Amino acid sequence: EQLPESAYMHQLLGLNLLFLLSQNRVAEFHTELERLPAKDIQTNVYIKHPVSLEQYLMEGSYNKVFLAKGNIPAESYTFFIDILLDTIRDEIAGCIEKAYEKILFTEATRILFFNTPKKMTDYAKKRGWVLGPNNYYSFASQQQKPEDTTIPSTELAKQVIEYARQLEMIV
Amino acid sequence: MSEKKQPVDEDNWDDDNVEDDFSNQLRAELEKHGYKMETS
Amino acid sequence: YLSKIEELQLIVNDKSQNLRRLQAQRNELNAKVR
Amino acid sequence: PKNPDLRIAQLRFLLSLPEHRGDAAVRDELMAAVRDNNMAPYYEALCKSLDWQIDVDLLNKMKKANEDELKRLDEELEDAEKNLGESEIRDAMMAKAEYLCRIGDKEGALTAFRKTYDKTVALGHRLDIVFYLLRIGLFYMDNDLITRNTEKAKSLIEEGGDWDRRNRLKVYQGLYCVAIRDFKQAAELFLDTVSTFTSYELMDYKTFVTYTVYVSMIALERPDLREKVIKGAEILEVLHSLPAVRQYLFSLYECRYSVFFQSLAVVEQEMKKDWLFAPHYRYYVREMRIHAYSQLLESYRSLTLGYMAEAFGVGVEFIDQELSRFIAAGRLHCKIDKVNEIVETNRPDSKNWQYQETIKKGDLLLNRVQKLSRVINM
Amino acid sequence: ILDKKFHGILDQGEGVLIIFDEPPVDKTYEAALETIQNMSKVVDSLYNKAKKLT
Amino acid sequence: PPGGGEQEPPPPPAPQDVEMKEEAATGGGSTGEADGKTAAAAAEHSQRELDTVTLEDIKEHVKQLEKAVSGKEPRFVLRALRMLPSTSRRLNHYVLYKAVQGFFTSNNATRDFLLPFLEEPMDTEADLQFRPRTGKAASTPLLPEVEAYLQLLVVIFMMNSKRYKEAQKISDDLMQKISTQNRRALDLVAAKCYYYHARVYEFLDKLDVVRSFLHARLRTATLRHDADGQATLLNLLLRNYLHYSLYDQAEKLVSKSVFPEQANNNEWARYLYYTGRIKAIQLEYSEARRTMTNALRKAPQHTAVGFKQTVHKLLIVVELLLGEIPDRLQFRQPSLKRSLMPYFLLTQAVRTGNLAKFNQVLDQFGEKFQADGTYTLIIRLRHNVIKTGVRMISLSYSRISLADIAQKLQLDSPEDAEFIVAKAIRDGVIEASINHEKGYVQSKEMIDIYSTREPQLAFHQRISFCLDIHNMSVKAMRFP
Amino acid sequence: DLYSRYKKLQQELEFLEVQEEYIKDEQKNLKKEFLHAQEEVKRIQSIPLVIGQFLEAVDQNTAIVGSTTGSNYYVRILSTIDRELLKPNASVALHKHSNALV
């Protein structure tokens, strides 16, 4: 415990924070934040702004994250915030399947990226969301809970065989 | 016995749940009635 | 050392003797009631 | 002599908790304190009231008069053991020891009560002692010393069927049930209102009427409510006496959905400045709100704020936030819409209320038996 | 409706009354009055616990 | 001054009576009866020695001025005790030194003769045989010198007393530990002295040398002997490897020593608590909240004892991080309101849908957070707050506009109300459908896949727990 | 001596194995013993029953009855009887020769 200061100390942990966020190492992400108690909180905007970035990545905010990505006046970060770009690309490509029952195409152009790309072919073909007239169309799927009725019945067979088994015991 | 090692250091509760509903907003809510009967 | 610790962790196993105490009082119960 | 003793604890509550209300209370607290020779129960309030500039002689002459009155009886005891009556010593200074205990604190209570209790074989004196315990344990709000001899008195009640102690303890357990959040029990104990003797704790029979309406307007919905307080007559005459009592009754039974908070404003502002409702008036208000909203929402399913603004009152956003909190509180299930101006109801609310209370009591009972079963074996 | 003489629901834009009913709620009493008493059971056993401890 | 002159004689002798006879009878029973007792990892007099340690945790701490225990140290160290006929004159000396203390005044030799207060177990070729005698007589003198709490020139002599206790570790790890369990008596004595050893290292720097020593001290269990020392040393290894951030916790994961199987209900319960905090720091909640609750209800045996309120504090951190939340002051104490009320105002803020109440409390009591070491709540609890708000309002409104709920919950924009509610669906909170042309979020209701699935799963837990109650009840009833 | 002191402990380990196996089967067997013993008790009634009346009880498993033969007896009782069913005054079945509560 001598610890003299250095050149890239305050943002080398930001580099590790960035790519260990881009690995989805969230347990590592929150056990890494412990060794610098107030350095990561009170100050050091290239720690506080990556974790404010993650504070926006907490719930669902997409383009506010890209505003924060559109302002880092530090060094490159690009080889890992492009991984963050892609992990937001499949984030919209994951949360598309919810109650976007119909969406006009150019708002998806705004949120996704790339105005008239072949990435619209990538999404509309690798994904579903049938490229119809100015609209990604939502298909329907069901579960019905029909047959089960039986996995209830056999898991209750397991559970009540267990109840009877523990009440059963005698040695 | 039980020295509990020290390096370290109804009547009350259901209506405290209800009071946590009552705490930050409308504590003595009786006048806001008469405050807002003439507002709109 | 080889013939030393083996006896000790053998005598660690004597909770089975107390289980036999439990079951001996249980057998006492059932035999006397019968 | 503990009959005028309730107004003391009344003013003990009424003085200290409202900040600006601190003049008339200390005035007639003095007017009650420097007579009756009161010495002990007000040292806390002496540290809550003023300095009482000369505490030197004005109270020590009083406690010296108390010492004279005390050991005239404690030197009457040898004159009463000369002719042993029914232990005339203890029979004399039992009520005079409760005089001394009206002066004193609860130590004179806890020794004089259990002293004179094993004297008598006539249980009426025992019943009077139990009344004394219930009253002084209510004075210090000792809600646990009194629940012992509630049961131990009901054992002394129920050797048959009587008048006195049955109706008296009906009043006593009614006040204990209204002390805690217990309302259907308070209504069932205040069911009588017929042979409730004009008392010291019933300092007005009219106040007894106000209490038994202020809990019966919560307890039951309507399957005896009209029959007791509307179709009845003995309650109807004395609620016909006061306007404000009959006001909320015929309001809520008439469903005048705007005068409700006027009536409730009067009753609630009195409820603030009234004792034995201090942890209670807050849940009381939302209770009345949901109880009115139930009988409103029961009839209609095609209703909205556009029906609220003219028959209920104003502040559509207040209706919005209030019903939002009360519906999202797991209470009065009915679903509301935004600007399409729709408040739809769920027509049975009897699916999960079925499942509800059983899990909600099993939670607390299992949490009890966890710790208490792991108490044994260290 | 208010007097429980009747199990209905009204319409204002339609003038339609509709009748519906589901009687049995025996499970609530059935278990709740067990549990409320067993509270007092374990509170009676509290004294035996305090006697065996100290 | 004459009054103080007669306030001088009565304070020595009654401590000089009971503080004498406690270790006289108790230590005689312990050291002599540890020969037999087929389970003498701790004798019944060793639990009585635990009880006397509980007594002089509040009776006397310092080396006792006014000349009371100041002669008990050169009395109780000057013990050769080679064989029992050579101890009878010492049994007389136990009263003869009291006669010396009564005829004259005693001689309080502080901080100079304490190191030749460690040469009396060498007196005229003395004994290393009864190491619980010399171990208990190296704890009960030398640890009240630490309860003097001097921290001046004798912390090195504290340390050298603990170096002679490392020589007690040498005699512990070499001298004939076959079936006597002098080692395990010294494992409970080791627990005690390692706590006070640890407090010495609390008043000084990090013990990374003695952390390697503590590594070896843990690993010397399970192979030479294996009883309860692994427990005590496991928590004594945990105590700062919690407080220091790095690796240590994956080691707690891969630790195949979670199970020392009994720890007098004290160490086991607090072990549950420590590993509960450990599982709580890596965001795992349901696995952690059960051992948090069990650790709270497992060692409760006071009223507001402190670290009981530390566990009762930390317990609802993870439940602020769940979404379901209890009212915390269900166990409030009159020695607790100070240490509950800012934290209770925090959970007060969380139990509504507001976030502007929540954001103020960080800047309010971030210094309290610096004290409590719980910064991780504020980076992620906003998530749970907004999930609670959207859950509440979604249960409220059947059909809501995003451009109303967003500004009602200060989101400042309607377009990410789509995002937050879209992951209120994607994260599985709400089912509610949206037209993303008009911006309205209609919500519907159903039951009966509730009643087909949901209650029976809870009843399975209830009856598994109550049948475990039945199992433990019978298998602990059957000792008679 | 450690060759002997280590080798002789294997015998006691084998012994504790044996008895831990043994008391399980004993415990299982004794319930079969117990129920057949219960029903071998039950040969007492079968058709010569005489009717006394219950008068008093000393304590557990001892009572006092007075027969309809005028006199009065100090009898023992069977462990079969549920003790709720008695002690105001009940017509009770007695044995002829032994004259005991049945």
Q: What is the DSSP string of D176-229?
A: HHHHTT--HHHHHHTT--SS----SSSS-HHHHHHHHHHHHHHH--SSSHHHHH
Subunits that touch chain B (at least 3 Cβ pairs < 8 angstroms)?
A: D, F
Experimentally determined by: cryo-EM
Q: How far apart are CA F247 and CA F348, in angstroms?
A: 35
CA dihedral G41, G45, G47, G53 (to 10 degrees): 170
φ/ψ (deg, to 5) at A119: -75, -25
φ/ψ (deg, to 5) at F380: -135, -5
**At CB < 8 A and 24+ separation, what contacts does D364-373 make?**
D364/E39, D365/E35, D365/E38, D365/E39, D365/E42, D366/F462, D366/F465, D366/F466, D368/E39, D368/E42, D369/E42, D369/F469, D370/F297, D371/F297, D371/F300, D372/E42, D372/E45, D372/E46, D372/E49, D373/F469, D373/F473
Helix axes F337-350, F356-372, angle to 10 degrees: 140
Q: What letters, b where the CB count within 10 A reaches 16 and e where it falls short, cover F201-217? A: beeeeebeebbeebeeb
Nearest-by-CA chain C residue for F174: C1
Residues of G within 8 A of A169 (CB-CB) are none
Q: For chain B, what percentages of helix, strand and coil (3-state, to nearest 5) are there? A: 40, 0, 60
How far CA F212 is from CA of D342, F172, F208, F237, F249, in Å, comes to: 71, 18, 6, 10, 17
Neighbouring C-beta atoms of residue D25, cutoff 10 Å: 18
- Measured in residues, chain A has a length of 171
Number of helices followed by number of strands (H, E) in chain A: 8, 3
D135 close to D101: Cβ distance less than 8 angstroms: no
- Using CB atoms, which residue from D299, D302, D355 is nearest to E1? D299
Q: How far apart are CA F156 and CA F162, in angstroms?
A: 9
Declared resolution, Å: 3.6
**At CB < 8 A and 24+ separation, what contacts does G9-14 make?**
G9/C7, G9/C10, G9/C11, G13/C10, G13/C13
Task: Output the DSSP codes for F348-373.
Answer: HHHTSS-SHHHHHHHHHHHHHHHHHT
Cα torsion G50, G54, G55, G61: sign: positive
Q: Is C25 helix (H, G, I), strand (E, B) or coil?
A: helix
User: Which is nearest to F215 in space by CA: F248, F254, F250, F168?
Assistant: F248
Q: How far apart are CA F256 and CA F271, in angstroms?
A: 14
Interface check for C28 against chain G (CB to CB < 8 A): the answer is no
CA end-to-end distance (rounded Å), chain C: 51
φ/ψ (deg, to 5) at D335: -105, 135
Interface check for F21 against chain D (CB to CB < 8 A): the answer is no
User: Which is nearest to F236 in space by CA: F259, F210, F256, F262?
Assistant: F210
Q: How far apart are CA D25 and CA E46, in angstroms?
A: 43
How far CA F342 is from CA of A41, A130, D246, F29, F373, in Å, comes to: 20, 54, 46, 51, 15
Interface check for E35 against chain D (CB to CB < 8 A): the answer is yes
Nearest-by-CA chain C residue for G79: C33
Rg (CA), chain F: 30
B16 close to F344: Cβ distance less than 8 angstroms: no
Residues of C within 8 A of G30 (CB-CB) are 27, 30-31, 34
Tell if the CB–CB gap between F425 and A156 is shorter than 8 Å. Answer: no
Q: How far apart are CA D260 and CA D254, in angstroms?
A: 10
Interface check for E19 against chain D (CB to CB < 8 A): the answer is no
Q: How far apart are CA E20 and CA D211, in angstroms?
A: 38
Rg (CA), chain D: 26
How far is CA C34 from its chain centroid?
A: 25
φ/ψ (deg, to 5) at D193: 50, 25
G53 close to G68: Cβ distance less than 8 angstroms: yes
Tokens of E50: 């305090």
Q: Give strand pairing partners of E9.
A: E18
Place of tokens 């105590």: F239
Kindly state the helix (H) or strand (E) to which residue D362 belongs, with its residue range: helix D352-373
- Measured in residues, chain F has a length of 480
Kindly state the helix (H) or strand (E) to which residue E9 belongs, with its residue range: strand E8-9
Q: How far apart are CA F176 and CA D17, in angstroms?
A: 73
Place of tokens 């007098």: F264
Tell if the CB–CB gap between D359 and F458 is shorter than 8 Å. Answer: yes
User: Which is nearest to D154 in space by CA: D172, D166, D142?
Assistant: D166
Q: How far apart are CA G87 and CA G53, in angstroms?
A: 10
- Using CB atoms, which residue from F50, F199, F302 is nearest to B4? F302
Q: Give strand pairing partners of D343.
A: D303, D336
User: Which is nearest to D342 in space by CA: E8, F437, A99, E11?
Assistant: E11
Residues of D within 8 A of E13 (CB-CB) are 302
Helix axes F356-372, F376-396, angle to 10 degrees: 150
D168 close to D131: Cβ distance less than 8 angstroms: yes
Tokens of F47: 């639990």
Interface check for G20 against chain C (CB to CB < 8 A): the answer is yes
Residue type, E18: I
How far CA D177 is from CA of B36, B38, D181, in Å, comes to: 36, 39, 7
Tokens of D25: 């209370």
Tell if the CB–CB gap between D295 and E2 is shorter than 8 Å. Answer: yes
Q: How far apart are CA F65 and CA F67, in angstroms?
A: 5
Q: Is F152 helix (H, G, I), strand (E, B) or coil?
A: coil
Q: What letters, b where the CB count within 10 A reaches 16 and e where it falls short, cover F321-330? A: beeebebbbe
User: Which is nearest to D211 in space by CA: D259, D176, D237?
Assistant: D176
CA dihedral B29, B35, B36, B39 (to 10 degrees): -160
Residues of F within 8 A of B11 (CB-CB) are none
D318 close to B36: Cβ distance less than 8 angstroms: yes
φ/ψ (deg, to 5) at D37: 65, 40
How far CA D59 is from CA of D7, D103, D154, G43, in Å, comes to: 21, 12, 41, 87
Q: Is A57 helix (H, G, I), strand (E, B) or coil?
A: helix
Strands (E) located in chain D: 334-337, 343-345
User: Which is nearest to A38 in space by CA: C2, F375, F139?
Assistant: F375
How far is CA D66 from its chain centroid?
A: 33
Residues of G within 8 A of A171 (CB-CB) are 24, 27-28
- Using CB atoms, which residue from D344, D352, D371 is nearest to F398? D344
Q: What letters, b where the CB count within 10 A reaches 16 and e where it falls short, cover A72-104? A: beeeebeebbeebeeebbebbeebbebbbeebe
Give D97: exposed, middle or buried? Use CB within 10 Å, 0-12, 13-18, 19+.
Answer: buried
Interface check for G34 against chain C (CB to CB < 8 A): the answer is yes
How far CA F184 is from CA of C10, F7, F135, F170, F191, in Å, comes to: 16, 44, 11, 14, 10
- Triad D78, D79, D85: Cα angle to 5°: 100
Tokens of D12: 């003990």
Task: Output the DSSP codes for F283-300.
Answer: T--HHHHHHHHHHHTTS-
Q: How far apart are CA E46 and CA A62, in angstroms?
A: 57
Tokens of G86: 């008695």
Interface check for B7 against chain D (CB to CB < 8 A): the answer is no
Q: How far apart are CA A69 and CA F158, in angstroms?
A: 57
Nearest-by-CA chain D residue for E19: D347
Neighbouring C-beta atoms of residue D112, cutoff 10 Å: 22
Neighbouring C-beta atoms of residue F155, cutoff 10 Å: 14
Q: Is D135 helix (H, G, I), strand (E, B) or coil?
A: helix
Task: Output the DSSP codes for F221-273.
Answer: BTTTB-SSHHHHHHHHHHHHHTTS-SSTHHHHHS-S----S--TTTHHHHHHH
Neighbouring C-beta atoms of residue D154, cutoff 10 Å: 14
Place of tokens 């559109």: A70
Nearby residues of F110 by Cβ (< 8 Å), 6 or more positions away: F63, F70
Place of tokens 């925090």: F346
CA dihedral A79, A85, A87, A88 (to 10 degrees): 170
User: Which is nearest to A123 in space by CA: A90, A100, A149?
Assistant: A90
Q: In the structure, do chain B and chain G come into contact, i.e. share 3 or more CB pairs under 8 Å?
A: no
Tokens of F436: 């993303």
Tokens of F445: 């209701």
- Residue to mutate among D365, D373, D377, with most E CBs inside 10 A, is D365
Residue type, G6: Y
Place of tokens 């050769």: F80
Residues of D within 8 A of B11 (CB-CB) are 143, 180-181, 279
How far is CA G37 from its chain centroid?
A: 8
F258 close to F222: Cβ distance less than 8 angstroms: no
Place of tokens 């909170």: F429
User: Pairing relation of β-strands G50-59 and E18-19?
Assistant: unpaired
Cα torsion D167, D173, D179, D183: sign: negative
Tell if the CB–CB gap between F479 and C22 is shorter than 8 Å. Answer: yes
Nearby residues of G62 by Cβ (< 8 Å), 6 or more positions away: G76, G77
F384 close to F429: Cβ distance less than 8 angstroms: no
Q: How far apart are CA D236 and CA A151, in angstroms?
A: 63
Could you tell me which residues of chain D have a Cβ less than 8 Å from any Cβ in chain B? 143, 180-181, 261, 265, 268-269, 272, 279-280, 282-283, 285-286, 313-316, 318, 325, 329
Cα torsion D91, D95, D97, D98: sign: positive
- Measured in residues, chain C has a length of 34
Q: How far apart are CA A47 and CA A13, in angstroms?
A: 7
CA dihedral F352, F356, F360, F366 (to 10 degrees): 70
Tell if the CB–CB gap between A31 and F282 is shorter than 8 Å. Answer: yes
Kindly state the helix (H) or strand (E) to which residue F304 belongs, with its residue range: none
Tell if the CB–CB gap between F480 and C25 is shorter than 8 Å. Answer: yes
**How far apart are the CA of F464 and the nearest CA of chain C, in angstroms?**
25
F16 close to F60: Cβ distance less than 8 angstroms: no
DSSP-derived letter for residue D84 is -
Interface check for D231 against chain E (CB to CB < 8 A): the answer is no
**At CB < 8 A and 24+ separation, what contacts does F199-206 make?**
F199/B7, F199/F146, F200/F146, F200/F155, F200/F158, F200/F159, F200/F162, F202/B7, F203/F151, F203/F155, F204/F155, F205/A1, F206/A1, F206/F240, F206/F244
Pick left, alpha or beta for residue G63 (phi over 0 → left; psi -120 to 50 → alpha; otherwise beta). beta
D248 close to D217: Cβ distance less than 8 angstroms: yes
Residue type, F195: Y
User: Pairing relation of β-strands F397-401 and D334-337?
Assistant: parallel
Q: Is F35 helix (H, G, I), strand (E, B) or coil?
A: coil
Residues of F within 8 A of D344 (CB-CB) are 398
Q: How far apart are CA F151 and CA A5, in angstroms?
A: 32
F193 close to F151: Cβ distance less than 8 angstroms: no
